[model samples]
Target: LHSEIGRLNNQSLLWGPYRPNIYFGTRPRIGKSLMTGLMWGKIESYTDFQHTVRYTCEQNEGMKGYGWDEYDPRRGGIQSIHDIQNGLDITTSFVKIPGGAHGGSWAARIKGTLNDDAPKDQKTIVVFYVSQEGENSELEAVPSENEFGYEGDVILKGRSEALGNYKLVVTKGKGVIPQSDHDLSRLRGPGQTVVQSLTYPDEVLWQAKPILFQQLKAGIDWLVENKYDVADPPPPWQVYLLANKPGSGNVHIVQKVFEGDFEFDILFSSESAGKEVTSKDLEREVKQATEVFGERFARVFDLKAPFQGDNYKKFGKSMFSNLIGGIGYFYGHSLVDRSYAPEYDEENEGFWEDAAEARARHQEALEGPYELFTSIPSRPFFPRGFLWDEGFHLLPIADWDIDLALEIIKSWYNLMDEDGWIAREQILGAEARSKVPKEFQTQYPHYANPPTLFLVLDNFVERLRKLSLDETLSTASVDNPEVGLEYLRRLYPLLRRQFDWFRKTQAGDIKSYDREAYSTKEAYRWRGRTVSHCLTSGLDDYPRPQPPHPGELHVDLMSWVGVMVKSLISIGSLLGATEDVEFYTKVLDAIEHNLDDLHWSEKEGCYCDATIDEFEEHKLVCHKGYISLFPFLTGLLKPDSPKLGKLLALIGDESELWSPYGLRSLSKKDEFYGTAENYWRSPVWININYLAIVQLYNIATQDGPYKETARDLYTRLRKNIVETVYRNWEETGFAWEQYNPETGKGQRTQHFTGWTSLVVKIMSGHH
Candidate 1:
C-alpha cells in the first residue's frame, strides 16, 4: 500500500493508461513535461493504422469521406490499443531451473469463455528496466538455490489490491509469460526441440517503479554482451521501465525464464512532490488535461468513466487529422540505408559552372526508382522532427492545443543555429544520428528546408487575427492578447533574425560576380549545389540548372520571399509597428519585381530558374512544371499583374503541366517525364496542388479580372484531391505519399498524412 501519511500529499499530476504516463511539471520548471511509463505493452507493426480499416470500404462508390472508425476513442482511447489485435508476441531468453523447487509455479488472469472471448486475448509483459532517478539499474541473472528450469515450474500470483493500493504481480511473465521465447536461438534451431523452464528463489522484489516502452531490442544486446556472461544471454525483446531506486535493485537479476502460465505484480508508487497525495488531486488534474486535449474537436465523445469523451476520430475529422501527440521516442539509434548514395565523381564537381541540370544525365546514367534510394535523405516511420514535415503536423494541432503546439514549435526554434540556421534535417543527438548512415547524418548548414515554419507562423497569425476580433474569447485577457501585440513582441526578434539568415545564406554567391548590378536577393539557390537546386526547397528533382548560376535567380526563391515578407507585414500590423510593416511591404514588392525581371522568360512565356551560364550571362531555364507556378502560387503575381495571364496559360496547357489528377510535377512534354529519376519530377502532390488553389483564391480577391479561372481551379483541384484521397482510401485504405499523374492512383509512401491532411481544409471550402 502507498503511504499517504509520509511525504505524500493531495495535489497530483501523473496520468495515462495502466501502462505509461508523464509527471506534468517539476517545481522550478513548472509546466515543463517529463515522461515515464507510456506505451508499455506489446510489439507492433507500423501498418496497424491502415490495417485497422481506414481503407477498405462498402466497399463503395467512394466519392466523399472515409470512415473515421479507426481513430475513434470510445473503442480505445489515447493508447489506441484496440487498433490492432490484443497483442501479438516476443523473443527468446534461456535459463536452467530445477522444477518443483521453492514452490515456484506459473498462472495468469484470463477472461471469457473459449467461444465469446474478446478479453481473453488480453496480455501483459514481463518488463526489465533501469532506475529513472538515474542510479545503478540493471537486470542480471545468476542462479536461485543453484537451480534453473524444468526442475521447478514457477507459478505467480495475480495483482492484489489492499486498502487503496493496487499491485500487479508476476513471478515470470504473468499471462504474458508464454511457455516459449520468440528468440529462436535460445529455443531451437530449425526444427530442433528446446523444451525447458526456469525458476529462482523467493520474492526478488523492490518498492516503486513505472513501466513504459522505449526501443529496447538494441539496449538488451548491449547489456547482455557487456554486463553479463555471453553464455547467459538476455531476452531478445526488451521490456524497458523506470525504477527511481538505488544500486541495490540497480544490479538486479532475473533468475527465472520470462514465460509460462503465470501472473506478475507491479505496484506503482508516486508521492506528490515531497508530500502525501490523496486521490482527489489526481481526479482534478486528469479532468484539466482531458479538457485541454479535446478543446478544439468539433464533435462529442459518447464514452463514460476513467476514459471519457474526446473521441479521437471525430476530433480527427475536425481537429487535425489523426495522430497521438509525439510523446518521447528514440528508435534505439539512427539508421539509414546507404546503398543509394550518389557515387562521387571528379568530373561532376565543376558543374555549377554550367547551368541546366541534366536530371537523367543520359538515360543510361539514370539510377532509380532505384528502389526508393534511401541513401538520398530519408526518415524513419517513427516520431522524429523533420523541418519540412513539422509545418504540416502543427496545422491541425495548433487549432486544438495552441500551448502544446507552441511547446513543439519552441523546441524546434531552439534547434536554430547561432547564425539563425537550423539544420534542414535534424537527426538530433548521438542516438538519433545512429539511425542514419554517416553520409546523410551530417546536416548541411547552407541547405534550407521548405520554409514550413513560414507557413506555420502564417497560420498562427490568422488564428490570432480571428481571436483579436472576438470580444468574449476565453484564451486571451485584457492585458495579455494571446497572439496580440505582446505575442508579437516575443517572436519578432527570432523571426526577423532567422528570415535574415535564410536570405543571406541561401543567396546565390556568384563566384565571378557584378555586385554593382545585383544584391543578395537578386539570385539564390541552396548552399552546397547538388543535382537539383530546388531539392532543398523540399522539391527534390523538379529540375533546375545542373550546376547553378553565378547567382541563380529563381522564381521559387523570390516567390517564397514574397510570401514570407507578406506574412511579416501582417504580424507587424497586428503589433502596430508601422516601420516593420512598411519595411517588409517594400521588401515584398522587390521580390515581386525580381520574379518578373530576373526570373520570368517572355520568350517561353513562363517564370523559370534564372541563372548566369558558363558563358557568363543571365539566362532562363524553362522546364515547365511546379517550379514554374511558384510565382503564381505564392501570390507574388498580383491579379492585376500581366504575368498571372501567362502563368494561367501554362497551367491550363493539358499537354504540359495540367493533368486531371492535379498539377503534374513536371511537364509531360519534358524529356525527363517518363523516368523515375526523382519523386517530384512527375507526380501529383496534394500539397502542391493545394498551394496553387490557395494562392489562386488570394490573387482572385485582390483583383477582379481572374476570378473565373481562380474559381475553376479551386473547384477542380479541391474536388480532385478530396475525391482522389477519399476514393483511394476506400479503394486501397491508404493516403499515398504521392499519386500517379496519368492514372490518378495513389503511389509513393503508403500513407503520408502530413500535408495530405490539407485535403480536409480544402474540402471545407469546396462548397
Candidate 2:
C-alpha cells in the first residue's frame, strides 16, 4: 500500500535519537491484547481463532508511530492496520495490538533527535498515518475480478505528531544514526519531537491525497504568502558633464589691454589720400626720428603720437614749462593778487618754475614709463608685485597701458587696512576664510597661492617714463583720480608697518626643521617655523638636522622694502617734496645694502632665510619653490647676473625637484613632498608656473641659453591644463579642485572650483 506523505520546501529533515518503525494490521483489532503480548515477548504462546502463535521479538524494530483500523465484532468483525513511516527513513517495522474492541492495534515510537544538531532543528518536517485493506472481507476476493480485491490500498487518515529537533548526521563510510555518538545531556528543555502547527492549515488535512496533488497545493499557497515583483525608477536630469572639458574648454588672455586696431595700417591712413603708407617708408622715417632724438622720439611718433595726434607734441614739450609757469603764477597771484602772502616764494615767479620743473620731471619719469603704465584687465591686480605671479601679469599689462597699471598700484595701496595687511585671496569672500591661514593677512605668507605684487611693482616703476598712454595722457588729471599719488603717500607708512610685521610674524615657527618633524609630536612645538633643512633633505634619508631659514626669506621681505622706498621716493619727488625723497632714499639704501650683506649666502650659492634675532642658534637651509625666484622678479638679481645660474640649476634637477606635471611645491628630494592630499607646501600650483615663466623669460630675453626651456615649460603648462580639463569633462563632466601630480587625475572636493574656472577664463580670454 502506498500512502501520501507531507510536502517540504527549501528545508531538510533529520532523524533523531528515536529508532523509527512501521506497523501493519489486517483489521483494527484482531487478537489485540495477544498481538501486543507476542510482539513484546510478554506471551510465549498465544491462541488466536483456534491457531497457536509463538513470538520471538528482537531490538531491530524500536519505538515508532503507525496507524490502524478495526471493525466491530458484533457486526461482521474485521480489523486492519496501516503503517506509514511518513517521509522518514525507517530501518525497522513492527505491529502491536492493545486490548480494545475488534482487536485492532497500532504502532508508535519516539522519532528524531533531542539535540540542536538534529535534522528537525535544521529543516521543516511533517508526519502521516496510513490504513491498509483487510483480508477475507467481501472487498478482498478475486485478483482480477474485483477493484479492491487484487490490489492493496492505503490511506493517510491523519498526520502523526510532527517531528522536531531532528538532525541528520553523515559519516564517510558508515550509515548515519541520529544521536548514536552525540551527547543528549546538554539538550535543551524544548526537544525536537514537539510538533508545531503547519503554516498552511487549510492544505494540511487528516486525509492524504496523491503526492503530486499535495505538492502542487502547498506550492501554490506558499507563493501567495510571499509577495514578489519588479524594480523601481530613476532620477531626473541624469546626465553629467564630462570631467575633461571643464569650463567648456575656454582660455584666458593674460597680456595687457587688447590693442585692438591701434597699431594697424588703417589707423595711419590719411582720409584725403585714401592710401596707407608703405612699410618701407614708415620704417625709414621711424629709424631717422629715433636716430635724431633717440628711441623716445620714435616711440612718440610710432607708438604714442598717432593716438594723441598733433596735440601730444605740444603737451610733451611744454607741459613741464607750463607747469612751472602755472605754479609761479599761482604762487605770485596768491601773494600779489590776494591779500594773503606766503613765506619765501610769494613774489619770486622764477622760484616756482625751478621748483615745478624738478617736480614735473620726477612725475614724468616715475609715472610715464611703458613698463609701468600698461594694464591687463582680467589679470590679478597687485600693488607692489609683492608675490611671484603678480609680476608676470604685470609685465604684460604694463606693456599695454601704463596709466591703468598705475591705477592698479594705487588701488592695492588703498585697500590696505589700518594694520598694514591685505587679505591673502582678494577674490575669496567670507567663505574662503576657512581655507586661508590667519597669519596670511599680516605676512606675505607662502603656501599654494600666488605671490606677485612687489616684483611687478618694482619692474613697473623702474621703466615708468617709457610708457605710452597716447590720447589717455592728455586726460590724466592728478586730483586723486583713482586714489592718485596722495593715496600712495598714505600707504607709505602702512607698507613699512607690513614689512615689519612680516619680519616679526610670518617666518618658520614649526620645530626641528626636519621634514619628518611635521608628523611627529615635535611639529606642534614651534608655531610658524617649518623645518627648512628637513624640507630640502635627500628623499631616502629623513629628519635632517634643522637649519635656519634661507636668505630668500629676508630677501623677499626686503625686496618689498625696496619697492616701498622707490614708490615713496617717486611720490615725494612728483610732489616736489625734497625731504621725502631723502627720507625714502635713506630707507632704500639701508634695505638694499643690508640685503646684500646679510641674506646673500655666498657659501651655499643660494639665498637663505635669515635668523629672526641676534641669537643665530637656529639657521635653516631651505628654498621656497617660488619664493627663491623673487630675486629675479624684484630686480635684485639682474637678468644677466651669474647668481641666476645656481637658481636655474636648482630648478632643473629632475629626480629631486622636477616633476612630469610641473615643479612640485616641495622638492621630491625633500622628505615631505607627497605625504598628504592638498598639502599646499608639497603640491604644484598654477601661480608658481606663471611666476617662474615670467622670471625665466626675463632672464632668457637677455640672451640666456634656457629661453626655449621657459617657452617649453609654458607650453607644457598650457597642455596640462587643457588635458586636465578635457579628461575631467570626458569622465565626470565637471571641473575639479586639482589633479594628481602622478596620474593627472582629479582629487578632493571638486565643485564649482574658482581657480579652475579662472584658469579657463585666462585661457579663453573670457574673464
Candidate 3:
C-alpha cells in the first residue's frame, strides 16, 4: 500500500504548480489532493474592479504576455505576468526543496510592481487560497494581529493522506493596507486587523473574481450597519472575519491588502521532512536554479548568429521553459465507447457509416479515472494530454532533461488499454472535460491518433547508440546506457502492440482492389477521417480525398508507420531481439518501396494520397502541401533520390508550400488554400515546418546531389520560422497556435508553446 505512496513522494511527482490552466496554481499528482492558487486585482474603481483581477489564463484579460522566464519540472520556476490593462507586473517565483515523506517542500514568492502608468492610489488586494478535494484533508489558519499596519504573517497548518502534516509559513509581506484614521479606529486601539480568512465550497476556488467581490460587499455592508467609522471609500478588509470552517467547505482563503508595490512569500514546509525551509531559503534556491537553467539551456540549445542576441536568447529560454512548465499530472476516468462488436472491424467501404451508426446506437461509458502525467499543449485551450502533441513536446524536453522526457513517454504508454489503445484526447476528469465541448467528450476505441511518440523514441535510441560508442552529443547528459536499454526493453512489448493495433486498424486496402504496389499489406489510411476532417491525422483540416472511402491510402499515415517501424527495429536491435528486428525490417522495406510505388504520382510530380475514383480506378489525390512532402518530411526519400528534387521544388516554390514566413500548410495555388476553418489548410504550423527544416538540414549535411539546395532552403526556412515566431511573441506577448501565411501574424490559440517550442530546437540546430 505504501509502495505507491513512496512513488508519489518521489522527486518527479512531488510538488509544483501542476495546474497549467490557471496563472499560478500548485497541486500534487494525486487525484484528490490539496491545491493552492493566487488571485489579485486593483480595487481602485468599482466599475472595472473584477476586470483587473487576474487568476486564470484568460484570453479576454488582454495582457501583454505571460509565462515562465525559467522553469524545470523537477525544480521550480518563475512566472511573470504583465497586466497591461492595470499597469502591473506580477512575478511568481516558485522553488522546490526535495526532501520529505510527503511530497517534499516548496515555496512561492509573489511580488507585484506597479508600472509608471499605474494609478497613483491604486489599491491591490491579493488572495491566496487553498482547497481540499476529498474528505481526507484538514486545514487550519493561524494569523497574528499584533500591529495595526495591515502587514502581518499568517501560518497555515494542513493535513492530508498524501501530504501528511504540513505547515505553510506565509511570511509578513512588504505592503501596507491603506486605511484612513476613521477606518483605523474601528479595529480598536493599536493592534492590527487580523488577516481576512474565508471558507467556501471548492467551486469558488476557481471563481476568485466574483467571490472576492461578494466578500468585499459583505465587508462594506458591515461598515454601513455599524455607522461608527464609515469612511467615504470604505477599506476592503475592514470587518472580515475568519470562518475557517472545514465542515461548510474545505477551501480557505487568506487575503492581504496593499496600497502600492508588494512582495510576499508562501513556504510549504512538511513535518515529515523534519526541517522548516523558509521563503528566504527558497529565494536562494530560485537564484541557483535560474543559474543552472541558463547554463544548461546555453549548452543544449546554443543559438547562433542572428539568434544569439539577448532578446532571442530570452525568447528561446521562455519557449522551452514554458513548454516544460506546462507538464501536468491529470487524474480521472474518461468516457470510452467500446460498445462496437468485437469482430466488426472497418475493413470494407462505407465502414465509417457503420461506426457512426453504432456510436449513435450505443453510448460511451465512463471508464477508469485513469491517471495520465504528460505535458499539455495550450494552457487555456488544450490543457489536457494530447497523444500526437506529446511527441513533439518531448523533443526539446529530451534534449534538456532526458529522464523527464523518458518518464513522460512511459506515463503516456501506461495509459494504453488491453487492445493497445490510448485515447487521442485525454479528457480525463470533469475539470478536463469542462474545457471541451459535448461533441468531443467521449472517445472511440476504434479511432487512432498519429503514432508520433515513435519519433521521440527513435531519437532516444539514436542518442543511446551514440553514447554507447562514446560519441559526444548536444544534450548535456544522456542517461545510463543500461537504463536506456532496460527502459526500451520494458517499452518494447507495448510499442509493438501499439504498432500492430495502428497497422491493423488504420490498414488501407491494397490487395482487395486491382491496384499494383510493391507491398500490399504495408499501406495505411487514417481511420477517423471524414469529408472535411481527418482529426486523427493531427493535421485536422488538411485536405484529403474528396469522398471519404476505405479504399483511400494516406501518404502521411504510411510515412508515419514507416517512422514507427524504423523505431521498433532500432529498439529491437538495441534490446538484442533479432527476430523482431528482422520482422520490422521487412515491414520497413515494404513501406519505403510502397511510398514510391503506390502513393507517388509522376504526373503530379510529388507523392499523393490514392483513392478509388467513381470508375473504381486508382486515382492519386494531389494537394501540393505538407501531404505532398510526407515521404520527404518523414525522411523516407534519400538525399540523392530523384524524388528529392521535385519535393524540394514544391517546398521552395513561391506559389506552392513555400512562404516568406515558413512552409505554408497548403500551397497558395490550392483551391482550399484559405478555405473554411482553414486550420491545417493555409496557416503555418510550427511542427510540420520544424519537420521540414530538420529533414532539410539532415539532407544538407549528408553527401548528396541536392546538398547545397537543401542547405540553402534549410538556412532560409529556419531563419524565417524562428524570426516569425519570435516577432509574434514579441508583439503579441504570446506564442500562437498557427501563423498567418500572408502576414506572419500569430493566429488562433494564444500561449500555444507546446510543439511551437520546436523553434528553440530550430534555433539551436539540435537534431
Candidate 4:
C-alpha cells in the first residue's frame, strides 16, 4: 500500500496471495488481487516479441517480430530497465502510455488486419474498482508500513478516501493529435457504486461476473464532443457525480485530478464503453490482478562483470529484463489454501499406485481454505508456482534484494500447515483454478515439491554470516547478525518441523525388513518416489533408471536430505540452541554412514540411487550424472578424502557427466543420454551445474593434493556455464528454461533466467 487505504503494483506484474494466479500473455492489470482501481485502456497481446505489442499496416503489421525493440518508451509499449547489479537487472520500472510516455504510442488494433482504417478499433469501456479514490496508483496516501514479510498488512503508496471522477491525461504536442474534437456529450459512469444497482435483484456487488457488461456496446460514442467547445485537447475538463461508487464502468475522466500527493495524468485512445468491452475487459483485468509480480531483476542486470565481454552485459541484461517481465506477467494471489497431502496411514499402500479412491480424497484435501500468494514461471504459458521451482526462481534474486527474497521465503513458510506440509503446486482459489488445466488442478496429498525454499534460507544465512560480527547483532549496521536474529529464531521452529516432516513422510525404512542390500544396511529414502520423480525435485521428466518399490531407498533424495540437515545446523547455531545442534549433528552422522555404506558404488567410483530387489539384495542405479555427483555436490566428502578423488575423476571424465556446455543431467554414457526424453535426461541445467561448481570451489580451497581436480572442476564448470549461456543468448537473443548439453541451444521457456542467472556469480568470479 502507498498508504492506509490504497496500494501500488510496484513492479511490472501485480502480486496476490488470496486468489494466487493469473493468465499470462494478455493486456492484464495483473498481480495484486481484485481489478485494481478500475481505469480503462486499449487491449493488446504479444503473439510475437518477434512483432510486439503493436503491428500496423504502416509498420509491416503482419511481418515477423525480429525488428521490435522495447527498451525505450518510444520503441515499446513500455521500457527503461533499471537497478542492475553484477550483470543482472533488479528492481525495475516501466510504463506504456497509450500515445506517449516520451513520444508516439500505439492505439488499439487487431492482428493480421492490414486495413489502415478498420472501423476505429479503439476498444473502450469504463473499469470500476472497489477501492476508494477510484483506482490504484503509485502515490503516497498512507503511512509507510513494513517493507517485507508483512504481506497481508502492508500499507503502500496508493490509496484514497474520496471519489467522484478521474481521468487519464494524454498530451498532444510532440507529433500527437488531440481527438476530443467530435460531438459526443460526456455522461458520468454510474459513478462508483453502480455494481450494486447493476447486479439485478441485488446480489453482492462483488459477485459480478454477473455485473452489467450486457449493457455495454463498443464503437465510437467516446468521441468526446467539443459541445461546450471545451478548450482544445480538453483543457481543464471536469465532472461532478454521485459517490458511494459503481461497477462495470470505464469513462474517460475530466483532466486535472489529485488525491493528496497522488495524481492521474494518464491517457489512452479508446472508442466506446460497450458491453463486449465489459466482459472481455473483465476477463483480462481479473486474470491480471491474480498474481502479484516481482520487485527485482538481478541487481546486476546491466553491470559489467570480470572478463565479461560486451556480449554478456547486453545478453545477460536482455534476459534479466525478460525475466522481470515474466515475473510480472505471472503474478497473482489466491484466497484458498489448496495444498493437500494424502493420509499417511493408508496401510503403506503407496498413494501413487494404490489410491483407488484418490480422486474422492483429493476433493476433500483440496477443500482446506487459506490464503496463498505467488508469481508464475511463465506469462502466456505455465503460470503456477510449483514449490520446487520457487527456489530456482529466486536464487538469482536473493543477491539483488535480500528483503524480497526473505519475504517470499516467509510467505512459503507461512503456507506450512500444522504438520508442516505445503502443497507443491499452489492452486489456490476458483479464479486461479480456472486458469489451470482441469486434469492438473487438484493438489495431491502424498506428492511433494522439492525443498527450493531451503536454497534461499541457506544462502540468506550465509549472507547474514558475512554481514555480521556478533552472531546476534539484533540492531544497527551491516554486520549485526543480531539484526536478523528475529527471523532466525521465528523461522527455525517452522523449518525444523518441515524438515522432520520430510523425513517421516518420505522415509524408506528398509532396516525393518532385515535382509538389506549394498555396502551399508538401510536408511531413509524419498518414499512413494518414482523414477521420473520430478514431482519431488522439480526436474520433470528427468529420467531415472529405476523400477520403484515400497522398500526402495533413494540416493539423490537422501543427498538433498544431507544438504537440508547441514542447513538446519546453520539455523540452529545462529539461534544458539545447543540441543538442536547436538541432535541434528547425529542426524547428519547417520546420513554420512548411509551415504558411504549403502549408496556408494566402488565399481563406478560414485554414489547411485538405491532400490532393493525382491530377492532382498543390493541394487545400484549407476546411470550416472547428477545422481552420481550428489556426494560431492552436497559436501558429504572430505576435500582430501579418497571419495573426492573418485568423484572428481567422474566429474571431469570426458565421456560421462562432462560436456562441452557443462555437465549433462545424466551421464552421456547412459542409455537415456541421447533418447527423445530430454528434460533432466541429458540436458545441461545451470542450477545443477552451478551447484557442483560452488561445491568444487569450496573443495578446491580445502587441504592437500585435492586442489588440482577441485579447482579444475570449478574452473571448467564455471567457464562452460558462462560461455554456454552467453553464446546461446547471442545467437538466439533469448535465455531459456534449460539448454541442450549436445548443442548449447536454448530449450524450454525462453525467459527462465531464474537459476540460469547463476552465471552472474561465475561472471564476477566470486563463486
Winning candidate number (TM-score): 3
Models ranked on TM-score = 3, 4, 1, 2
The lowest-lDDT stretch of 10 consecutive residues in candidate 3 is 468-477
Q: lDDT rank, highest first?
A: 3, 4, 1, 2
lDDT of each: 0.44, 0.31, 0.79, 0.48
Write candidate 4's Cα lDDT for 117-213 as tens digits: 3223322122222221134322221211322111111111221122112222222111111122322213332111112212122112222222322
User: Candidate 4 — worst ten consecutive residues by lDDT sum?
Assistant: 83-92
Encode model 1's per-residue lDDT on 251-302: one tens digit a residue.
2211222222332222222211222222233334334434533443433222
Q: Candidate 3: which pairs clash?
A: 147-192, 148-192, 332-369, 333-369
Residue-level lDDT of model 2, residues 1-767, one tens digit each, is 00111011001111100110112111121111010111100111111211111111111122122111111111111111111111132211122222212112223221222233223422212122112112221111011222211111111111111211111100011112112112211221111111111212211221122321243245334433533112321110000000011010011000000001101110111212323233343334334322333333224223221223433332222211111111000000000111111211212223333433433332211110011111111111111122233334333333333333444454445445445554332422211122235433222222111224554444444444322222233113222243333434454566556554443433333243322221121111111223432221111112222432331133454554555566557656755678867866766666555554545566756555444333534344444444445455454565445567676776665664456655556666555556543354455454444445456655555566556655555455444554454465446533444556676665643321223432321232201
At residue 765, candidate 3 shows an lDDT of 88
The alpha-carbon root-mean-square deviation between model 2 and the true structure, to one decimal in Å, is: 42.5
User: Residue by residue across 1-767, what tens digits does model 3's lDDT show?
Assistant: 22332253254456879888788989887777788888887865444555677777776555777889898877788999888776789999998886767768999999999989998667776778777776657777664444332345677787878889988866777866565554535553222324444566553354555666676677556656767453464344333322222222466567666778988899889888888988668889899888877778888899977799999998898899899999887877788888765423666667667767777765788888788778989987778899999989999888877767777888899999888898888988766777788678989787788788888887878888883111122222244566567677888999999999888678888887778988878888887776678888998888998888878999999998888888887888878899989999999889989998899889989999999888888889998899999989887877789888989988999888888999999999888888999998899999999999999999889898999999999999999999999999888778889899899999999989789999999999856
lDDT of 2: 0.31
* lDDT of predicted model 1: 0.44
Q: Of the candidates numbered 1 and 4, which has the greater lDDT value?
A: 4
What local lDDT does model 1 show for residue 382?
26
Q: What is the lDDT of residue 23 in candidate 3?
A: 87
